[PDB]
Structure 1
């Protein structure tokens, strides 16, 4: 796998929902390995040229993948979140984020999962889900 250059069109494209039960274990393994090899804590399909709704995270309160992630709950208003991104080396942006979120989706074995997160972990979930919608910092 390769983390695509900052001018890759995939970064603006929409990731396709994964058909329920599709075997994506190798994809998840590859994305996880690319994320850690590059020293990151989050990665989305688009960033490695995989236009599928898959994110991987290595965050303080969640480590693993989410397939077909959706945000189902969040706190009102916003807080400041300084963020970088493996697709944009050297760039940090002060983003407005929800302080707390609930994310729902599937793990690699297609077990339904629910992730309640605050602070850094919540910011990462928002950032990575944004990627699947072609939204970048």
Structure 2
């Protein structure tokens, strides 16, 4: 895969729900490889031209994929999160993020997963889910 250029339309598009049970194993492998090759800690389908709701992460309290990730709970208010993005090399933005989130979805074997995250990992998750909605820093 390739990390799309900062002017790619896919970055602003909405990624489609993955049909339940669809074989995503190779896609996740490719996405993980793209993320690590670029020295990232997270990556979303849109960033590699895959308009499917798949994220991959290598964050302090979560490493792996989430298929159809959703935020089911979060803290009120916002906190400071300085973030870069593999799609925007050289740019750091001070984002407002929820300090804690719970993210739910499916793993590559279509087992339901739940991720309770705070701080950096919570920011990671919110940033990647944003990508799937065409939202960038």
TM-score (norm 2): 1.00
TM-score (norm 1): 1.00
What are structure 1's unaligned runs of at least 5 residues? none
- The offset of 1:118, in angstroms, is 0.1
Task: Specify the SS of the correspondent of 2:58.
Answer: strand
* C-alpha distance in structure 2 between counterparts of 1:103 and 1:110, whole Å: 15
What are structure 2's unaligned runs of at least 5 residues? none
- The offset of 1:17, in angstroms, is 0.1
Residues 1:100 and 2:100 aligned together: yes
* C-alpha distance in structure 1 between counterparts of 2:108 and 2:29, whole Å: 9
* C-alpha distance in structure 2 between counterparts of 1:6 and 1:54, whole Å: 20
Residues 1:68 and 2:71 aligned together: no
* C-alpha distance in structure 2 between counterparts of 1:39 and 1:45, whole Å: 16
Aligned residue number for residue 36 of structure 2: 36
Task: Specify the SS of the correspondent of 1:5.
Answer: coil
- The offset of 1:120, in angstroms, is 0.2
* C-alpha distance in structure 2 between counterparts of 1:38 and 1:104, whole Å: 26
- The offset of 1:64, in angstroms, is 0.1
- The offset of 1:2, in angstroms, is 0.5
Cα RMSD for the two superposed structures: 0.2
- The offset of 1:68, in angstroms, is 0.1
Residues 1:11 and 2:11 aligned together: yes
- The offset of 1:72, in angstroms, is 0.2
- The offset of 1:44, in angstroms, is 0.1
- The offset of 1:46, in angstroms, is 0.1
* C-alpha distance in structure 1 between counterparts of 2:118 and 2:33, whole Å: 25
Task: Specify the SS of the correspondent of 2:47.
Answer: helix
